[PDB]
Amino acid sequence: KQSFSNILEIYFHDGRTILNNIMEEKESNDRIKKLESDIVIHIGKQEAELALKVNSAAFQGDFYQLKSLIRSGADPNKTDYDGRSPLHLAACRGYEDITLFLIQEGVDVNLKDKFGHTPLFEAVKAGQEGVIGLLVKEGASFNLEDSGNFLCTTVAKGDSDFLKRLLSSGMNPNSEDYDHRTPLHVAASEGLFLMAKMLVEAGASVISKDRWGNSPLDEARLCGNKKLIKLLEDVKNAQSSI
Amino acid sequence: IVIRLHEEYFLPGEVITEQGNVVDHLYFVCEGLLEALVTKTDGSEESVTLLGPHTSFGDISIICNISQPFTVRVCELCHLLRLDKQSFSNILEIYFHDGRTILNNIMEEKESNDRIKKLESDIVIHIGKQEAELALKVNSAAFQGDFYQLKSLIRSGADPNKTDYDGRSPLHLAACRGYEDITLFLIQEGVDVNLKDKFGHTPLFEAVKAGQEGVIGLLVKEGASFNLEDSGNFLCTTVAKGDSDFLKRLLSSGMNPNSEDYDHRTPLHVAASEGLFLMAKMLVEAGASVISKDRWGNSPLDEARLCGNKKLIKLLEDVKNAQSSIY
Amino acid sequence: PLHLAACRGYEDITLFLIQEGVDVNLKDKFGHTPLFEAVKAGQEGVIGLLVKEGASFNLEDSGNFLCTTVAKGDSDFLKRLLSSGMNPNSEDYDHRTPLHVAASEGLFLMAKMLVEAGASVISKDRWGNSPLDEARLCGNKKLIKLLEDVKNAQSSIY
């Protein structure tokens, strides 16, 4: 038995073929169909191990290991042990070829991570603009459970590029936070004209209220930046027109 | 290695090792002469090296973890000393610190004498992949909580400090599937306790996210408790979700309930923004601020009345009695 | 044996100990439903497994423990008792619906998780008053506003 263990270690693909024929003859004859629960457990554990292999390969890239694993028949839809899909992982590390192969492989383009991140979020945080474009052209969206407060925290961080990636992916920049708060209010209170302009490029909501019962006009005029108040007033008038 | 050895004599014409089959015994040549022979892609065998004195072959297979690069046939009567691969692995595992020198000196030879065993491809990537795959499978083991298997894997030549490639510590892996004893003696291996991952999630932040009390106790027992660059942000999100288990759980490690948010929003301010009376004052009982002026510059009482509850202001004043006595 | 495996957090242990043929509705001397034991000790796996097998959480009282948990405000326990589908529209030691208790507390998130399962917002109490009256009595009118938000459909029926 140990010798066969070494032989399957050096011939893992032939071991996969062995288990395939074992399944076929289990459904064929009345020898292996007896006590098939452990066989199902074994094939599940094996496929989990192959999922680890394919996710590590995509972590390093390895398009050649990608064709090796499609030859091995490992599950592409399955994520890694931790709970991160192969497309999320390929978004986290810059690899366009891996992402397009995953798209062609039927891997779910839009999915949540173990902690609940969309692949677009991984691309945005890791600076993968190309992966963001590929996800957009495929049609994936964030669908984050806390999109509002995440947008507000991004605004508080002040990173313009992060929110521009979010807008390119398609998120409503003025999405209400947990306490029905519009990020335009904190954006105007901070006073950075860049993010107010960015917030109104995709369509701001000055009409939308906040937890304070305030308006972005009031926050902008409290900050004192004249151009900020001017732009926010223009967007408020645009909202009032429609 | 010496105490486990055997000699053997081969007459001319025999083949000691075929390139096709995996090695099981590696042979040290002490007398006689023998020839190294890779199966040539032209459809023939050619010739590589004539290994007569104080030389061994088959080791490069035990390092590269692949088939034999060369078939090896004898030339004349040769006195060969033979060791099995199993005992070599079983001594490499216990003598792994002495085992590093094996791959080190074999590669520096492959650099110095390229005609010996360099005619193939790189091997350092293969050993790195062995280590990485062992790391992934010990991650799976920690997800499975096999104390015996995990101990055997770690003592078989594993570095406990190597976490998930993103950064999920083995504490993450044992806690995510609910393993307490696994978490404890895996963290007693010397692995770092503040191993924040790719995301910046603390081992204790992961524990509070995944909902396990045992890891909550254990990580505080070891030290390097829940730390973060943001305290009131996740606190306010959890208060909004109203996950009382998570609320007490973040407060269990003692994370600051008087901290700030994306703006100057204390978690007590968020609790006043919600409305209830039980969780609301669990933050000020740990030291949250009821006079923390917000980004506007107003005390939480003002937002408490703004949201639509004066009951809230009454609770805030019940907490503020001592402060007003100080005031 | 489900109690013993669940108390120390064992999922696979619980499942094949329960596939041995042991009864699934084994209330103890205290009358603690195994699923009740699971909701008391805090384990999700047993929650799933016992419903998978059958003979789910059953009790002679539903609103009593629900009201006590609402008073304790254990949101995990609140969702957990509601996870098995135990009646949130039941009664108490008196005719005190769990929705009435939620109105007696004051908050807005947990309060309407019981009527989303089918709790009664017109359940007259032992006095004989709708929960709106106790909601205003406790000192909150927006509680009545939430109750009316739920009661819009009933008033359309009314």
Side-chain angles (χ1 to χ4, degrees), chain A residues 31-62:
Chain A
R31 179 188 29 140
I32 314 180
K33 48 171 53 93
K34 325 175 146 125
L35 263 283
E36 47 205 344
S37 39
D38 296 42
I39 302 152
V40 175
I41 301 169
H42 174 32
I43 62 186
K45 203 52 201 81
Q46 145 263 314
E47 202 82 318
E49 204 278 332
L50 325 190
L52 271 53
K53 178 267 160 185
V54 306
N55 267 76
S56 87
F59 175 72
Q60 170 55 80
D62 318 69

PDB file of all heavy atoms in Angstrom, chain A residues 31-62:
ATOM      1  N   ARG A  31     -19.595  -3.572  -5.918  1.00  0.00           N
ATOM      2  CA  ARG A  31     -18.458  -3.704  -5.014  1.00  0.00           C
ATOM      3  C   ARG A  31     -18.076  -2.381  -4.374  1.00  0.00           C
ATOM      4  O   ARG A  31     -17.894  -2.313  -3.153  1.00  0.00           O
ATOM      5  CB  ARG A  31     -17.241  -4.290  -5.748  1.00  0.00           C
ATOM      6  CG  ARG A  31     -16.011  -4.434  -4.854  1.00  0.00           C
ATOM      7  CD  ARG A  31     -14.771  -4.833  -5.639  1.00  0.00           C
ATOM      8  NE  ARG A  31     -14.810  -4.351  -7.014  1.00  0.00           N
ATOM      9  CZ  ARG A  31     -13.766  -3.855  -7.663  1.00  0.00           C
ATOM     10  NH1 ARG A  31     -12.580  -3.748  -7.087  1.00  0.00           N
ATOM     11  NH2 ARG A  31     -13.914  -3.455  -8.923  1.00  0.00           N
ATOM     12  N   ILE A  32     -17.958  -1.320  -5.172  1.00  0.00           N
ATOM     13  CA  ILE A  32     -17.536  -0.026  -4.650  1.00  0.00           C
ATOM     14  C   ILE A  32     -18.712   0.841  -4.209  1.00  0.00           C
ATOM     15  O   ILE A  32     -18.533   1.719  -3.353  1.00  0.00           O
ATOM     16  CB  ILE A  32     -16.682   0.701  -5.704  1.00  0.00           C
ATOM     17  CG1 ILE A  32     -15.640  -0.252  -6.291  1.00  0.00           C
ATOM     18  CG2 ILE A  32     -16.013   1.931  -5.116  1.00  0.00           C
ATOM     19  CD1 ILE A  32     -14.756   0.381  -7.342  1.00  0.00           C
ATOM     20  N   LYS A  33     -19.912   0.606  -4.747  1.00  0.00           N
ATOM     21  CA  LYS A  33     -21.083   1.350  -4.291  1.00  0.00           C
ATOM     22  C   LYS A  33     -21.392   1.083  -2.825  1.00  0.00           C
ATOM     23  O   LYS A  33     -22.108   1.873  -2.200  1.00  0.00           O
ATOM     24  CB  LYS A  33     -22.297   1.011  -5.157  1.00  0.00           C
ATOM     25  CG  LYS A  33     -22.517  -0.474  -5.374  1.00  0.00           C
ATOM     26  CD  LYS A  33     -23.854  -0.740  -6.047  1.00  0.00           C
ATOM     27  CE  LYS A  33     -24.011   0.082  -7.317  1.00  0.00           C
ATOM     28  NZ  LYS A  33     -23.553  -0.659  -8.523  1.00  0.00           N
ATOM     29  N   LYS A  34     -20.875  -0.006  -2.269  1.00  0.00           N
ATOM     30  CA  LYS A  34     -20.983  -0.243  -0.837  1.00  0.00           C
ATOM     31  C   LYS A  34     -20.042   0.695  -0.091  1.00  0.00           C
ATOM     32  O   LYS A  34     -18.850   0.769  -0.402  1.00  0.00           O
ATOM     33  CB  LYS A  34     -20.650  -1.700  -0.525  1.00  0.00           C
ATOM     34  CG  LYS A  34     -21.119  -2.660  -1.603  1.00  0.00           C
ATOM     35  CD  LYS A  34     -20.683  -4.087  -1.331  1.00  0.00           C
ATOM     36  CE  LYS A  34     -21.728  -5.068  -1.827  1.00  0.00           C
ATOM     37  NZ  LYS A  34     -21.151  -6.066  -2.769  1.00  0.00           N
ATOM     38  N   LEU A  35     -20.586   1.412   0.894  1.00  0.00           N
ATOM     39  CA  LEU A  35     -19.833   2.379   1.694  1.00  0.00           C
ATOM     40  C   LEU A  35     -19.178   3.438   0.803  1.00  0.00           C
ATOM     41  O   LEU A  35     -17.959   3.619   0.791  1.00  0.00           O
ATOM     42  CB  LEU A  35     -18.791   1.673   2.570  1.00  0.00           C
ATOM     43  CG  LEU A  35     -19.174   1.379   4.024  1.00  0.00           C
ATOM     44  CD1 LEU A  35     -19.082   2.641   4.871  1.00  0.00           C
ATOM     45  CD2 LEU A  35     -20.565   0.764   4.117  1.00  0.00           C
ATOM     46  N   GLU A  36     -20.022   4.144   0.050  1.00  0.00           N
ATOM     47  CA  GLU A  36     -19.558   5.198  -0.841  1.00  0.00           C
ATOM     48  C   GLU A  36     -19.424   6.550  -0.152  1.00  0.00           C
ATOM     49  O   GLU A  36     -18.926   7.497  -0.773  1.00  0.00           O
ATOM     50  CB  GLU A  36     -20.501   5.333  -2.041  1.00  0.00           C
ATOM     51  CG  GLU A  36     -21.975   5.362  -1.688  1.00  0.00           C
ATOM     52  CD  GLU A  36     -22.853   4.896  -2.833  1.00  0.00           C
ATOM     53  OE1 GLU A  36     -22.359   4.848  -3.979  1.00  0.00           O
ATOM     54  OE2 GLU A  36     -24.035   4.577  -2.588  1.00  0.00           O
ATOM     55  N   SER A  37     -19.857   6.664   1.105  1.00  0.00           N
ATOM     56  CA  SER A  37     -19.744   7.934   1.815  1.00  0.00           C
ATOM     57  C   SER A  37     -18.288   8.348   1.977  1.00  0.00           C
ATOM     58  O   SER A  37     -17.932   9.508   1.733  1.00  0.00           O
ATOM     59  CB  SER A  37     -20.427   7.830   3.179  1.00  0.00           C
ATOM     60  OG  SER A  37     -20.178   6.568   3.776  1.00  0.00           O
ATOM     61  N   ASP A  38     -17.427   7.410   2.380  1.00  0.00           N
ATOM     62  CA  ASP A  38     -16.010   7.724   2.512  1.00  0.00           C
ATOM     63  C   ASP A  38     -15.382   8.040   1.163  1.00  0.00           C
ATOM     64  O   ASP A  38     -14.453   8.847   1.089  1.00  0.00           O
ATOM     65  CB  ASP A  38     -15.275   6.569   3.192  1.00  0.00           C
ATOM     66  CG  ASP A  38     -15.751   6.333   4.609  1.00  0.00           C
ATOM     67  OD1 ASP A  38     -16.977   6.393   4.842  1.00  0.00           O
ATOM     68  OD2 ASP A  38     -14.902   6.091   5.492  1.00  0.00           O
ATOM     69  N   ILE A  39     -15.879   7.428   0.087  1.00  0.00           N
ATOM     70  CA  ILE A  39     -15.369   7.744  -1.243  1.00  0.00           C
ATOM     71  C   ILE A  39     -15.742   9.170  -1.636  1.00  0.00           C
ATOM     72  O   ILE A  39     -14.937   9.897  -2.232  1.00  0.00           O
ATOM     73  CB  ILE A  39     -15.884   6.715  -2.263  1.00  0.00           C
ATOM     74  CG1 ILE A  39     -15.456   5.308  -1.840  1.00  0.00           C
ATOM     75  CG2 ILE A  39     -15.354   7.030  -3.647  1.00  0.00           C
ATOM     76  CD1 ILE A  39     -16.378   4.214  -2.310  1.00  0.00           C
ATOM     77  N   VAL A  40     -16.967   9.591  -1.313  1.00  0.00           N
ATOM     78  CA  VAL A  40     -17.367  10.974  -1.568  1.00  0.00           C
ATOM     79  C   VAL A  40     -16.511  11.932  -0.749  1.00  0.00           C
ATOM     80  O   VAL A  40     -16.071  12.977  -1.245  1.00  0.00           O
ATOM     81  CB  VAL A  40     -18.868  11.161  -1.276  1.00  0.00           C
ATOM     82  CG1 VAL A  40     -19.258  12.625  -1.413  1.00  0.00           C
ATOM     83  CG2 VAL A  40     -19.701  10.297  -2.209  1.00  0.00           C
ATOM     84  N   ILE A  41     -16.260  11.591   0.517  1.00  0.00           N
ATOM     85  CA  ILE A  41     -15.389  12.418   1.352  1.00  0.00           C
ATOM     86  C   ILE A  41     -13.997  12.513   0.738  1.00  0.00           C
ATOM     87  O   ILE A  41     -13.384  13.588   0.708  1.00  0.00           O
ATOM     88  CB  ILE A  41     -15.337  11.864   2.788  1.00  0.00           C
ATOM     89  CG1 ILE A  41     -16.734  11.838   3.408  1.00  0.00           C
ATOM     90  CG2 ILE A  41     -14.387  12.687   3.645  1.00  0.00           C
ATOM     91  CD1 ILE A  41     -16.809  11.060   4.703  1.00  0.00           C
ATOM     92  N   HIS A  42     -13.477  11.387   0.245  1.00  0.00           N
ATOM     93  CA  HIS A  42     -12.141  11.366  -0.338  1.00  0.00           C
ATOM     94  C   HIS A  42     -12.064  12.228  -1.591  1.00  0.00           C
ATOM     95  O   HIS A  42     -11.105  12.989  -1.765  1.00  0.00           O
ATOM     96  CB  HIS A  42     -11.735   9.927  -0.655  1.00  0.00           C
ATOM     97  CG  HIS A  42     -10.441   9.813  -1.398  1.00  0.00           C
ATOM     98  ND1 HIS A  42      -9.401  10.701  -1.225  1.00  0.00           N
ATOM     99  CD2 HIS A  42     -10.020   8.918  -2.321  1.00  0.00           C
ATOM    100  CE1 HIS A  42      -8.395  10.355  -2.007  1.00  0.00           C
ATOM    101  NE2 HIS A  42      -8.744   9.275  -2.682  1.00  0.00           N
ATOM    102  N   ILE A  43     -13.052  12.116  -2.481  1.00  0.00           N
ATOM    103  CA  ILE A  43     -13.010  12.926  -3.696  1.00  0.00           C
ATOM    104  C   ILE A  43     -13.187  14.403  -3.359  1.00  0.00           C
ATOM    105  O   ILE A  43     -12.570  15.266  -3.995  1.00  0.00           O
ATOM    106  CB  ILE A  43     -14.042  12.443  -4.736  1.00  0.00           C
ATOM    107  CG1 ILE A  43     -15.470  12.561  -4.206  1.00  0.00           C
ATOM    108  CG2 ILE A  43     -13.742  11.011  -5.157  1.00  0.00           C
ATOM    109  CD1 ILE A  43     -16.516  11.972  -5.129  1.00  0.00           C
ATOM    110  N   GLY A  44     -14.001  14.724  -2.349  1.00  0.00           N
ATOM    111  CA  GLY A  44     -14.120  16.111  -1.927  1.00  0.00           C
ATOM    112  C   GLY A  44     -12.819  16.672  -1.384  1.00  0.00           C
ATOM    113  O   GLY A  44     -12.424  17.791  -1.722  1.00  0.00           O
ATOM    114  N   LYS A  45     -12.131  15.900  -0.537  1.00  0.00           N
ATOM    115  CA  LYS A  45     -10.844  16.342  -0.007  1.00  0.00           C
ATOM    116  C   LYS A  45      -9.811  16.487  -1.118  1.00  0.00           C
ATOM    117  O   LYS A  45      -9.020  17.441  -1.123  1.00  0.00           O
ATOM    118  CB  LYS A  45     -10.355  15.363   1.060  1.00  0.00           C
ATOM    119  CG  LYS A  45      -9.366  15.959   2.049  1.00  0.00           C
ATOM    120  CD  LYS A  45      -9.895  17.248   2.654  1.00  0.00           C
ATOM    121  CE  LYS A  45      -8.763  18.101   3.204  1.00  0.00           C
ATOM    122  NZ  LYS A  45      -8.088  18.885   2.133  1.00  0.00           N
ATOM    123  N   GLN A  46      -9.804  15.550  -2.068  1.00  0.00           N
ATOM    124  CA  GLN A  46      -8.890  15.650  -3.199  1.00  0.00           C
ATOM    125  C   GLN A  46      -9.158  16.910  -4.010  1.00  0.00           C
ATOM    126  O   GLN A  46      -8.223  17.630  -4.376  1.00  0.00           O
ATOM    127  CB  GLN A  46      -9.008  14.404  -4.080  1.00  0.00           C
ATOM    128  CG  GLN A  46      -8.843  14.668  -5.568  1.00  0.00           C
ATOM    129  CD  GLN A  46     -10.172  14.825  -6.285  1.00  0.00           C
ATOM    130  OE1 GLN A  46     -11.097  14.040  -6.080  1.00  0.00           O
ATOM    131  NE2 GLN A  46     -10.270  15.839  -7.136  1.00  0.00           N
ATOM    132  N   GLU A  47     -10.432  17.204  -4.284  1.00  0.00           N
ATOM    133  CA  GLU A  47     -10.757  18.401  -5.050  1.00  0.00           C
ATOM    134  C   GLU A  47     -10.421  19.666  -4.274  1.00  0.00           C
ATOM    135  O   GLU A  47     -10.042  20.675  -4.875  1.00  0.00           O
ATOM    136  CB  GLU A  47     -12.231  18.391  -5.453  1.00  0.00           C
ATOM    137  CG  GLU A  47     -12.549  19.272  -6.655  1.00  0.00           C
ATOM    138  CD  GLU A  47     -12.241  18.600  -7.984  1.00  0.00           C
ATOM    139  OE1 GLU A  47     -11.189  17.937  -8.099  1.00  0.00           O
ATOM    140  OE2 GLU A  47     -13.055  18.736  -8.920  1.00  0.00           O
ATOM    141  N   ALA A  48     -10.542  19.632  -2.946  1.00  0.00           N
ATOM    142  CA  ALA A  48     -10.093  20.760  -2.136  1.00  0.00           C
ATOM    143  C   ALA A  48      -8.590  20.969  -2.280  1.00  0.00           C
ATOM    144  O   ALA A  48      -8.113  22.105  -2.403  1.00  0.00           O
ATOM    145  CB  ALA A  48     -10.474  20.535  -0.674  1.00  0.00           C
ATOM    146  N   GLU A  49      -7.823  19.875  -2.268  1.00  0.00           N
ATOM    147  CA  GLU A  49      -6.379  19.990  -2.454  1.00  0.00           C
ATOM    148  C   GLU A  49      -6.044  20.558  -3.831  1.00  0.00           C
ATOM    149  O   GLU A  49      -5.146  21.401  -3.966  1.00  0.00           O
ATOM    150  CB  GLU A  49      -5.714  18.627  -2.255  1.00  0.00           C
ATOM    151  CG  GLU A  49      -4.250  18.704  -1.847  1.00  0.00           C
ATOM    152  CD  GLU A  49      -3.323  18.904  -3.028  1.00  0.00           C
ATOM    153  OE1 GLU A  49      -3.677  18.470  -4.144  1.00  0.00           O
ATOM    154  OE2 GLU A  49      -2.240  19.499  -2.842  1.00  0.00           O
ATOM    155  N   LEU A  50      -6.759  20.113  -4.866  1.00  0.00           N
ATOM    156  CA  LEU A  50      -6.523  20.666  -6.198  1.00  0.00           C
ATOM    157  C   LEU A  50      -6.923  22.134  -6.264  1.00  0.00           C
ATOM    158  O   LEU A  50      -6.307  22.918  -6.990  1.00  0.00           O
ATOM    159  CB  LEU A  50      -7.261  19.869  -7.276  1.00  0.00           C
ATOM    160  CG  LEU A  50      -7.448  18.357  -7.178  1.00  0.00           C
ATOM    161  CD1 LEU A  50      -7.987  17.809  -8.488  1.00  0.00           C
ATOM    162  CD2 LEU A  50      -6.142  17.675  -6.816  1.00  0.00           C
ATOM    163  N   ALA A  51      -7.965  22.523  -5.525  1.00  0.00           N
ATOM    164  CA  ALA A  51      -8.326  23.934  -5.451  1.00  0.00           C
ATOM    165  C   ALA A  51      -7.203  24.746  -4.824  1.00  0.00           C
ATOM    166  O   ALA A  51      -6.888  25.849  -5.289  1.00  0.00           O
ATOM    167  CB  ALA A  51      -9.623  24.103  -4.661  1.00  0.00           C
ATOM    168  N   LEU A  52      -6.585  24.213  -3.768  1.00  0.00           N
ATOM    169  CA  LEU A  52      -5.403  24.860  -3.203  1.00  0.00           C
ATOM    170  C   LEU A  52      -4.308  25.004  -4.251  1.00  0.00           C
ATOM    171  O   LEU A  52      -3.693  26.071  -4.377  1.00  0.00           O
ATOM    172  CB  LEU A  52      -4.874  24.070  -2.005  1.00  0.00           C
ATOM    173  CG  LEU A  52      -5.420  24.377  -0.610  1.00  0.00           C
ATOM    174  CD1 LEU A  52      -6.926  24.323  -0.599  1.00  0.00           C
ATOM    175  CD2 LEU A  52      -4.837  23.416   0.416  1.00  0.00           C
ATOM    176  N   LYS A  53      -4.056  23.937  -5.011  1.00  0.00           N
ATOM    177  CA  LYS A  53      -3.002  23.978  -6.022  1.00  0.00           C
ATOM    178  C   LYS A  53      -3.286  25.049  -7.069  1.00  0.00           C
ATOM    179  O   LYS A  53      -2.403  25.843  -7.417  1.00  0.00           O
ATOM    180  CB  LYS A  53      -2.852  22.601  -6.676  1.00  0.00           C
ATOM    181  CG  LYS A  53      -1.799  22.526  -7.784  1.00  0.00           C
ATOM    182  CD  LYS A  53      -2.389  22.767  -9.171  1.00  0.00           C
ATOM    183  CE  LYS A  53      -1.310  23.171 -10.163  1.00  0.00           C
ATOM    184  NZ  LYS A  53      -1.876  23.516 -11.497  1.00  0.00           N
ATOM    185  N   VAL A  54      -4.517  25.087  -7.581  1.00  0.00           N
ATOM    186  CA  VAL A  54      -4.846  26.023  -8.653  1.00  0.00           C
ATOM    187  C   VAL A  54      -4.834  27.457  -8.137  1.00  0.00           C
ATOM    188  O   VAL A  54      -4.406  28.379  -8.844  1.00  0.00           O
ATOM    189  CB  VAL A  54      -6.192  25.653  -9.310  1.00  0.00           C
ATOM    190  CG1 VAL A  54      -6.179  24.204  -9.764  1.00  0.00           C
ATOM    191  CG2 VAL A  54      -7.364  25.906  -8.378  1.00  0.00           C
ATOM    192  N   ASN A  55      -5.284  27.673  -6.898  1.00  0.00           N
ATOM    193  CA  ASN A  55      -5.273  29.022  -6.347  1.00  0.00           C
ATOM    194  C   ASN A  55      -3.850  29.503  -6.099  1.00  0.00           C
ATOM    195  O   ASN A  55      -3.534  30.669  -6.356  1.00  0.00           O
ATOM    196  CB  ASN A  55      -6.102  29.075  -5.067  1.00  0.00           C
ATOM    197  CG  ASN A  55      -7.542  29.474  -5.326  1.00  0.00           C
ATOM    198  OD1 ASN A  55      -8.345  28.671  -5.803  1.00  0.00           O
ATOM    199  ND2 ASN A  55      -7.876  30.722  -5.018  1.00  0.00           N
ATOM    200  N   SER A  56      -2.970  28.620  -5.617  1.00  0.00           N
ATOM    201  CA  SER A  56      -1.567  28.999  -5.464  1.00  0.00           C
ATOM    202  C   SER A  56      -0.925  29.290  -6.816  1.00  0.00           C
ATOM    203  O   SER A  56      -0.146  30.244  -6.954  1.00  0.00           O
ATOM    204  CB  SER A  56      -0.803  27.896  -4.732  1.00  0.00           C
ATOM    205  OG  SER A  56      -0.327  26.916  -5.637  1.00  0.00           O
ATOM    206  N   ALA A  57      -1.243  28.475  -7.826  1.00  0.00           N
ATOM    207  CA  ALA A  57      -0.730  28.729  -9.167  1.00  0.00           C
ATOM    208  C   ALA A  57      -1.155  30.105  -9.661  1.00  0.00           C
ATOM    209  O   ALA A  57      -0.319  30.895 -10.112  1.00  0.00           O
ATOM    210  CB  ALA A  57      -1.206  27.641 -10.128  1.00  0.00           C
ATOM    211  N   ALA A  58      -2.446  30.421  -9.556  1.00  0.00           N
ATOM    212  CA  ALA A  58      -2.913  31.743  -9.961  1.00  0.00           C
ATOM    213  C   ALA A  58      -2.304  32.843  -9.099  1.00  0.00           C
ATOM    214  O   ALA A  58      -2.146  33.978  -9.565  1.00  0.00           O
ATOM    215  CB  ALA A  58      -4.439  31.801  -9.910  1.00  0.00           C
ATOM    216  N   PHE A  59      -1.964  32.533  -7.845  1.00  0.00           N
ATOM    217  CA  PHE A  59      -1.291  33.503  -6.988  1.00  0.00           C
ATOM    218  C   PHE A  59       0.081  33.847  -7.542  1.00  0.00           C
ATOM    219  O   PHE A  59       0.498  35.009  -7.535  1.00  0.00           O
ATOM    220  CB  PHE A  59      -1.188  32.953  -5.564  1.00  0.00           C
ATOM    221  CG  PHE A  59      -0.401  33.826  -4.627  1.00  0.00           C
ATOM    222  CD1 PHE A  59      -0.920  35.029  -4.181  1.00  0.00           C
ATOM    223  CD2 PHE A  59       0.851  33.436  -4.183  1.00  0.00           C
ATOM    224  CE1 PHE A  59      -0.202  35.833  -3.316  1.00  0.00           C
ATOM    225  CE2 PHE A  59       1.575  34.235  -3.318  1.00  0.00           C
ATOM    226  CZ  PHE A  59       1.047  35.435  -2.884  1.00  0.00           C
ATOM    227  N   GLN A  60       0.802  32.838  -8.032  1.00  0.00           N
ATOM    228  CA  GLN A  60       2.048  33.110  -8.738  1.00  0.00           C
ATOM    229  C   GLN A  60       1.820  33.387 -10.224  1.00  0.00           C
ATOM    230  O   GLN A  60       2.723  33.902 -10.893  1.00  0.00           O
ATOM    231  CB  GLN A  60       3.019  31.938  -8.519  1.00  0.00           C
ATOM    232  CG  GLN A  60       4.296  31.931  -9.362  1.00  0.00           C
ATOM    233  CD  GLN A  60       5.107  33.205  -9.219  1.00  0.00           C
ATOM    234  OE1 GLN A  60       5.844  33.382  -8.250  1.00  0.00           O
ATOM    235  NE2 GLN A  60       4.976  34.101 -10.192  1.00  0.00           N
ATOM    236  N   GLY A  61       0.619  33.084 -10.729  1.00  0.00           N
ATOM    237  CA  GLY A  61       0.301  33.257 -12.148  1.00  0.00           C
ATOM    238  C   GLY A  61       0.303  31.888 -12.792  1.00  0.00           C
ATOM    239  O   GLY A  61      -0.647  31.126 -12.611  1.00  0.00           O
ATOM    240  N   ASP A  62       1.322  31.574 -13.581  1.00  0.00           N
ATOM    241  CA  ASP A  62       1.487  30.226 -14.124  1.00  0.00           C
ATOM    242  C   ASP A  62       0.336  29.838 -15.056  1.00  0.00           C
ATOM    243  O   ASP A  62      -0.467  28.949 -14.765  1.00  0.00           O
ATOM    244  CB  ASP A  62       1.648  29.196 -13.003  1.00  0.00           C
ATOM    245  CG  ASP A  62       2.546  29.679 -11.884  1.00  0.00           C
ATOM    246  OD1 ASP A  62       2.146  30.602 -11.159  1.00  0.00           O
ATOM    247  OD2 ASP A  62       3.656  29.129 -11.725  1.00  0.00           O
TER     248      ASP A  62
END
